[model samples]
Structures are given as structure tokens and as C-alpha cells.
Target: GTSNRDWWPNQLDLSILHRHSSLSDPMGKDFNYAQAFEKLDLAAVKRDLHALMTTSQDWWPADFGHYGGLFIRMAWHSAGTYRTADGRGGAGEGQQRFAPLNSWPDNANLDKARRLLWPIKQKYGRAISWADLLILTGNVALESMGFKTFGFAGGRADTWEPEDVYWGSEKIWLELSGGPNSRYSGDRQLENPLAAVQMGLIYVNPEGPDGNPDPVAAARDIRDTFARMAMNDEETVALIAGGHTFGKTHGAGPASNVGAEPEAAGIEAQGLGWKSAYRTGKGADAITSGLEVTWTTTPTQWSHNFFENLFGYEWELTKSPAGAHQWVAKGADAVIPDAFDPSKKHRPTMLTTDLSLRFDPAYEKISRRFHENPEQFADAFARAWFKLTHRDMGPRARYLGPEVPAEVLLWQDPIPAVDHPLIDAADAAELKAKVLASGLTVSQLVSTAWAAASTFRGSDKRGGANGARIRLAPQKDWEANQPEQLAAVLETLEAIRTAFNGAQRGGKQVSLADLIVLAGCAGVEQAAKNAGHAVTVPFAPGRADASQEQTDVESMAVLEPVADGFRNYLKGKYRVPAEVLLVDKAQLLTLSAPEMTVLLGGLRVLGANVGQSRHGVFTAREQALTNDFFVNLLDMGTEWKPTAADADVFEGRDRATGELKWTGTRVDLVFGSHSQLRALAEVYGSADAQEKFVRDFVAVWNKVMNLDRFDL
Candidate 1:
């Protein structure tokens, strides 16, 4: 019984609608979480969370009378799913409460963690989002256990279960043996956009690469996986040491005794997962990670014991009762206290990942440094943990709470708030006039504006036009941005910006960021007029110019597009077709299917393709925003066939005269090919819908420009 999706894997993937499309979300369009959170009493919420950490439930008792370790791991995994390649996963939307993540092997008992916070979530309602609560609970847990956190920001809005995240291509979970759809291959290089070493695991396997317990190989895997999650060597060591400082791994019995995960569990068990039938599974017999090991003597408190224990002992390989590979330090018997009983103590033990810090040359250096300097380790962990949790939250403007730190980190993509009054409509109209007269073509204006804003990913809420980072390094050199033509347009725009700023009085000035967007509005207005439809493309002011120093070039590099179908750009050959990549990009921008359809049509008519590729430019009247792209594409008179050189390319010809009509890429043809897309395409391509198409294009174009305007 093959599903519709499995039948044709290459069909234009519209499943992104589940996450980005408004239809999937239960909350109506008008609901605003930022405003909801603003009215909340922040201190009272933290007080409530602090009380819940120590109040152990009967069904799932807290370890050692404290749930600090569990909460920390819960928050860590919630945010840990974020990978730099796609910026799709993170604690931003509180996705851990849903499928796949909740049932993940690495996230075994996290279902209980969210259940514990349910009372608080119910009490606070919309005032506290699950996304923010997950991270904040972890911070409060650390503070409760005598560890200082950098700060907390409360502005994550919850969404429905993401249906198209592409966690992995594997058919089953935890399959890491180069099996069908395995991410690993030659040189063991994990596939692009995948951060985890194996399916259903966060970061890497605790046992080892494929559970092989080789410290050196474990270190290599840790390095590769952490780097994908945007963590460096120092940050990686600090996080591992700092996190292991408080928690102990569980494995009192064999994993075979455990029952089904949350998704597989019967309805009688409620929403709980991994219901172990072992004797008193609620207490001393818990089996998570299948490695019974405690990192430090006082697991309830913050200590440098992770580094101390690693440096002080000689370790030997061993297995737990659950048949999982683990390490035990020689002569450390009766050193670590039992998690369930205060009277008993177990021998000191470590997972292969923990030993990696001691064996790997680079990691060993950092481990030794942290061991000698506990203060450095503490600060490093505090900052790194804050970054890990908030990395996907985008700009500092989005952060809401009293605990937000005064100091700005580079990763926050800090932008200076508007200190001066912005230009009014008169000023904007004049600026548009000068921009249109500045000799920049519509393609240059539209393309440059898109390059600046299209980087935004609604998943993480990062990358948009506000920072003006397109003029900075990496983005400036990106082939997709049309660097040469971009430079020429930017030069003319800069000249216009300087002249206007020099003549301004009373500190009423415009930024290059504002000017770039205004130029696009002017271009769209001109194009609409050329199509015999007069329309005013909306514009918003207050976008700030971000300098090269304000930008993190290395981090910003991840935001670069591998393929943007709207611009008819494909960086290189990909496993999926260009249309699929286009849907992915559209989802990240939070565009609806019709919005995506109308945008592609409009851009094609405006001659906005990257590198001037003319592949999707179906209109003879270039620079005119019209429905000609859709009209011509949907015309029955034209027949299309793949060119001999490249099957991806198609040539459209007239059936009667055997004349070449036009050329297009898969991205252009998909609109007329797919039923859902074709339904919408037919609307805009209708004889009487010319005015409607122009209006729709302007609205969606404005939406893309304002995607990153969190202030508005």
C-alpha cells in the first residue's frame, strides 16, 4: 500500500505547508504570542517553574530528589536539534512536544519532562510558550542546583507538528550501518543538512560511532556532529563537561524490558512513552541510554568533577546490565552515590563520548585547560548554553524578558535600534523617484532586494533584509546574488543614500537598508505600470544597516542559498529537482503555496533570474510584472520537451508552426504541471484576473520584504 507521496517522490513537495502554511496551525492568523508574553509577570512564572523542579511526581520520581539533570537534558535536546546547514531544528517553536522528537531514542524519557511542565503550561496559558518554557525550565534547574546561567529570553511561539523537516531519509530509526538511505558513505561523511550521527539521536551516540566505543573515533564523530550544530571545539568540550557535571546516565536493567515509545504505546498509557515494565520502573530500575554511570560524586550540584574524574583515573572498557558499551575507572568503587538510595554508592563510570575529551588530542588540551580553570569552564558553559538555546531565535529585538543580558553576543546578529526619526511618506516617495531615475534596471533592483530578504528562514526566524548583511562579505560574493551587477546597483544606491543623508537635518536620515528595499518598491511600481496596472507597492521604514563587524561571516555563510527557484538559481546539481528546492525555500520564508506561485510568476516576468539565466523568463515584455509567465506556461498551444544537453532543461514550442516559443526550467513548468499549483496558476492566468494578479504580487512581495521585521 504505497501512499501518494511514496508513489512519486519527485512531485512538488507541498508538505512544507504543514509547518509554514497557516492551514496547519490551530491558532488563527491574528494571534500574537509576543503581546501575550509581554503582559505576563516574568518573575512569577520563573517562581512557578522553580517550585516544579523539586516537586517529584509519583509516576516519574525525580533522581536524587532533584530533576535538574532531566530538565537540562530536556532543554538541551529541544535546542540541540538545530543544524547550521538548514536552520530547521531548534527550541524556537517547542517542537520537542510533538512526534519524531518526542519518540526519538536519544529523547527517550523526555516525554515525561514535557508532561511535568504541563501544569505550568496550563497555568500560564499563552503567556508562556512551550518553546520558551522548555529552555527556561532548564535554566531555572541549573540556578536551583547552584549553577549560574547567562540569561533567559521568552519569545518562542509554538506551532503544529512539522510534517516536512526531513529528519533523515532512513526507513527506520537508529540505523547507522550504511543501510538504505544511510546518511554516511565514503570517509564516513554525514550527508548535508543532517546534524545527528544517527537517526533518532541528538548530536552523537553516547556509546560511540555505531556503538563501537572507540574514544578517538567517538571524538571524530563528536567534532563533526557538533560543528554541524554550530559548536566549535572549545564550546563542545565546555558543553559536554558542563552538562555531565550535574546528571547521571541510567541503566539499572536490560533495555529489552522496556515497552513501546510514545508514538507506539497504547492509548491506555496516556501520552507517556517508553513505559518500562521492569520492577518498579518508577525508581531504581529506570533504563535510559542503557549505561548506568554517574559523572561526579555530588551529582546534584555544579562541580569540575567531569574534568577531575577524567584526568584522575585510568579507565577500562566494560558493559552495563543493558548490554551497552561503557567505561569504568579503576579503583573508583563506592565513589559515586546511588541516584535512588543515599546509603549505596556505585563505581565511577563514563560513556565513550566523555572519554573522548580525555583521549582526543584537541579535546584533551581543552579538557586540561578547563580542569585547571574551573572559572573559565563555568563562564564558557554559561555562554555556550545560552547560545545553544537561543541561536535560532534570530535578533535581540525578539528577546522578551527581564533576564535578557545587557551584553550582546555576536551570534545574536545585534542591530542598533533606531535612534533617529525615520523618513515620512514624502521622503519615501522622493527616495523612490531618485531610485527609479538612478539607472538600475528592474531585475537588479528586484534581485538585490530578494537576495537581501530571501535568506530569512521562518523555522529559526533568522536571515532577512533588516541587517543589510547582503552588502557584507560572503553574501556580497555569493554567485546567487549576481555579485558584479549587485555591485553596480549598490554603488548607485549608495551615492543616492549619501546625497540624501548629507542634506538631512535634525537627524532625520535614511539607511542603506531602507534604500535597498525602497528601490525594489520603485521597480515593482514601474513594472506594474508597464503592465497597464497602476499599483502602489507597500514599503516600511526602520531597517538598520549592519556593518561587517556586526556580522559573523562564518555563521552568516550558512544562510546562503544552495537553490532559490524564485530567482531561477541552482547552485549545483542536487539529488532533488529544482522545484523541490524551491518549495523548501518558500517554506523557510513562510510563504503560502499561492503566494509562492504568484511570486515566481512575477519574478520571471520582471527578468529577476540569477546570473540573467532567462530559463524561467516566459515573457517577451521583460521588466513588466504581468501574468504572462503563467498565461504562456498554461497555454495548450505550447508543447514542451527536454533538450538533448540536459533533461532538467525544457524547450517550449508552438504545436502548429513547430516554432520555438520559450525556454524554462523544472521550476517554471511545475506550476502548470502540479494539480494544486495549476489550480492557483489558472486563477492568475485568467483573462479577467490581470488586475488581481498584479495586486497579489505586490502583497506577497511586500510580505517577503517584511519577513524579518520583528518590530512591526
Candidate 2:
């Protein structure tokens, strides 16, 4: 019978018409009942009601009557049931007719307050009843007013005629067989108060007696209740809190009563008239104090303020007078100077003791500390409140049917149609371009590319002063999975090597020394660029545009002897020859000077010095010979001058007297060891003896320059 019920068709048809028409559209034919019903979901309907109730403007703003009228009309449609007499109902389609049940005492002037939609219901057929719709509307209203859902069930049949109306004021009624009025006094009614208390207690001790109510509890309750009623598990308590954006409550009312003796009586006897006998003065004081504390604690216009107040201390008569009386009674048992005086028993309890016990100064101190340390308070409150409200509530209710699988309810709408930013095609293309332009090696490029892609766009990591830059370091093992970019970089290096090789002409060849210098330059340039520095070539001599006047022949001569001494020292000490030579040419050229007298004085001392020690003299001669070869071979077409004149030029003056007077022409004469010297001859030597001699001299110089034994 439940499976074959006609309720769905009836409700669906009615909901469609109600959704499409406004108050003015009584006979509108444009309504699509099925399409409109399809759009309704619990969450969206809740949000719509909340927005309508809270927003300041209304259907008619002239008076409270209009707003109240609007509210009643909404209440009707949300109840969802409609019928006519005959016990075979179809008046679910006649809600707009207004002549009959619309004017009944329960419905009254509200139906015409908003134009009803009967025609649309006719098209869609009733799928759900007016009772279910009314209860759902009430659910939305409670949520909109900041109350929790109390649970509901659907399936009440519609009936015809005023005789069928269940509205009677009789306190005692019976079924035909003479049973008591069970609906009014049943287990459901008895449990209602307890359920209300449980729901209210969530707001009462929201922060769970860390001594205060949690301001966030009401919002969380709203969210949780809606989630349960809607049968959705994925919606977080946080999203439910958003309902407070619509609802609010009064401060000094029946609901304000808390911690009161005769609690029910005090609440019922408030400004709104109801009768109860449980009231006490202490109870009244407790209620007022509780309200004041909660109000002060969560003074924020937002929801968090409510919870803050609950955990704060109470300073009412229950805690003060009652507590003091108990303390004094305890102290009375102790021996006193007066022994037993019957009159002293009537003396009032000490105010100081009451103040100390009931109104602790430490409460204020800790409250201040809580404000200063919000992280500590939030953590403490979250744990405490979670324990209190979640207790005895059982597992959270599930929204979907058992046939539907459960899933986590993230606080998001259903997934949108747009693409995810990280995995999009455009994102991939941009990353590839950035990697290539970074000009880094494969490994460095990979690292930088990943970092850039992971960073959020428009965030600090992506741009401005601290933006990303490429970095590189040597790797122990390198591989080339995609080698196009890598191969391009290597090709550039190879081209540079080939160009230098082709430049070598005549007797000259591209020596290992030249290749080493070229590679060093390229490596430095590449490294500097990676480090975000501007790169430029440093000036060097012997380039095509070099100035001839910058040359220094005299200093070149003095350098040769220093080279020879260094070479001899290396050979004797470690059996290793010098890899390069610094040549001294002036002393060797002075031997055949046209002005022999001018040259003899400087040379005679050198000859005498050379004659004193055989090995030292031979070293000096060897330096002179190397010097002559450099001067003759390299300095042939360049301007030549005496050592004294060169020295004057170096010092920016004409020096009259000095043993060594010349600017240094520090020529690095590269060479290798004896075996390497022969290898060089075979590789670069010419057929002519003179050219061969030059090649041999360069070989020896290379060895001297590179030798480990030569410290310099």
C-alpha cells in the first residue's frame, strides 16, 4: 500500500503551480507544475525562505498586517494539503478559489494575501499532501528564526466540510469506543518537551560548561537540524551556521529563563501569560543573571557571541545567598568564643564570604586571559561543546534513503561545469613555455617548473619582489629523456669550439690552453645568467682591436729570468718541469745593441753575476735565450724601445736611473712536460727549423705554467 500510494503525483502537481505564480496571478496558465517541483530541494527552499523573512523590504511595507498576512499565506502553501468534501479529494487544485475553505477560521484572510496557484496544480497532479507542505514550511520558518528542527512525518489525508475540522477546545474528548483523547496526551506529547529541552540545551551550554554557552551552537544546531531533515550528511555544521544571517531572538522573554528554581513556572509567568507554580525568587534571579551573562559574553551581532556567554560565570542569588548560607552553616559547627547563642543563629550570613564564593575575582581574570589567548579558548571550547551536545544524540542522522549510498558532505554546492585550474590544458601550455625560457639545465628546469605550477596564481609566491627564479647545480648522473632543449644547448657549445678552431692560421694551432680559456668563459657566462646577473665579456689583450701602445717589451725581458728561476726550482726539487714561462727579452737583445756602450754597463753586472755560479749562470742564460725568441717572434712588427725608456713609460715619466725600468709585458708562455713537448711538435710543428723551434719553445712553456711544483 505504501509503495502504491498516490501522494507523490498529487504533491508534485500542486507544488508546480504554487512555485510559478505570484499573489497577483490567480488564473495564469503559464505555470509548469512538474518543472517547478523539480527545482525544489530542501537546501534551496530553506535558503529562499530565510532570505524572504530577513530582508527588510516586503510584499507591502505600509503596515505589520501586510507582513503578518504574507507569513500566514506562506504557512498555508508550505503545509501542502488541500481537499473538498466527498472523501475522494481533488481540491488540491482549487487552493486559489477563495470562496470556501480559504475563508475558514484557520485559513481566514491569508489565502488571498498571496494569489494561490490552483491551475498549475491541476496540470502536475498532487504528489505530496498539504500537511507535509505545511510542516516543511514550518521547518523553514524555525530555521529562519534561529530554532532547530523538531522532526516531522508526512501523509495526512485531506477531508471536506467544517464538520470534519479537528478544531475543538474541549480538554477531554473520546473516540466512539470511549477512549481518552490520545493525540493530545500521548507519548509523543510527553516526549516533545524533552526534545525541546535537548535542542534548547545546545544553545544553553553551547561551549559545554567550560562554564559558558557556545555562541556558535545555535548556528551549528540550525545546520545540523537542516542537514538531518534534508537527509544530507556532507553539509558541515559550519554551513548550517549561515542560517543565523536571517533569524534573531528577543533578550527579555520566557525563553530567557535559565537556572531558575520552579523553572517552568517562572518561564510561563513571564510578560507573556501562561500559568505554572514552580516559581521562586532565587529562580527569577538565576534566570535574569543567566541572560545577562550570555548576552555580555556573546555581544557580537553574529552567532559566536551566544556560546561565549554560556561558559562565563553566574552571580545570581542561587550561587550567592544560597552558597553563603551553606558555608556559614559549616562554620557554625566549629568552637566559637560565644559557645551557643540562640540569637546568633538569626544573624545574616557574612557578605564577604558570599562574595568570595559566588563572585570569584578569578573569573574576571580568566575571562581577560581568554580574550587575550583566543587560540587556547577556541580549542578548549570546541572540545568541550563537542562532547556536551553530541552526547546521547546518537549517530548523526542521514539525509539520503538507504538505497542511496552515503558520501562526505563538503560545504560546497554540487560541482560546477567549469574546469579545474591546475589540470587545465592552458595551464600545461604555460608551464612548458616557462620551463624552456628559464634557460636552465634539464634538472633545474624541472624543479623550477614544478614550483611555479604549484604556486597559486596572483599570490605572493607567483609574482612581485620574491617571485620565482631558476637555479642550477651539477648533477652526479644526468639523463636525457626529452633532449631537444638540451641538445640545443650542447650544439651552441660545439659551435663556439669549432669557430675558435677555424681561427687558427699559419704556424698557429688551437692549443689546449686556448680551449680551456674559451670553456671557462662560456661556463661563467651561463652560471651568471642562471643567478640572475647581467653577463658581459671581460677585456683581454691580443684581440683584433687591441691598442699597439699597450705593449711592453722591456718588462717582458725581466719576466723571462723569473720564469727560468721558477722552472729550475721545480725541476730540481720535484723532478717536474715548469708548465709555462714568463719571458725576459731585454737582457738578450742588449748583447747586440748598436749603442754597445749604453748596454754594456747593465749587461756587465749580469755577466759577472752569471759567472759566479755555474747552475745559476746557466739558468740566467736559458732565461735570456727564451726571452730573445719571444721578442724576435712576437714583438717583430710592434714598436720596440730600450728597457730604460720602457720603464719611464711605465712610471709615467722619463726615469734617469734604475736597474730595471719597464712596464711588465706578462706573457704567459704555455708548455707541457718533455713528452708533451714532443707531442706538441708533432701536432703543430712546421717543416721549417725556425717554426719548429718556436713550437718546441711553446711546449716547454706549457709544462712550466701547469706544473704543480711551480707554486705560482
Candidates' TM-scores?
A: 0.98, 0.19
Q: Write the per-residue lDDT of candidate 2 for residues 636-670, one digit (tens) a residue.
A: 13232324643212211123433331222211112
Model 2, CA-based lDDT:
0.25
Give the Å shift of residue 239 in candidate 2: 12
Q: In lDDT terms, how accurate is model 1?
A: 0.89
lDDT of 1 by residue, 1-712 (tens): 8887898766776756545456777777998999899998988878998888789888889998789999999999999999998898899989898888888989988899899999989998888899999999999989988999999998898877654687888978898758989899899999889999889999998999998989999999999999998889999999999899987888889998888999999999898889887788865788878888899998889988888889999999999989999999998767898877878987778999999999999999999999999999999999999999998898888999889989988888877789998989999999989998887888888988988888888777888999788889988999989898889988999999999999999999998988999999899998988877778889999999888998889988889998999988888899977888888888888888989999999999897898788787888899998899988999999999999999999999999898998989999998989999999999999999888899899999999999999877
- lDDT, each prediction: 0.89, 0.25
- Clashing pairs in model 1? none
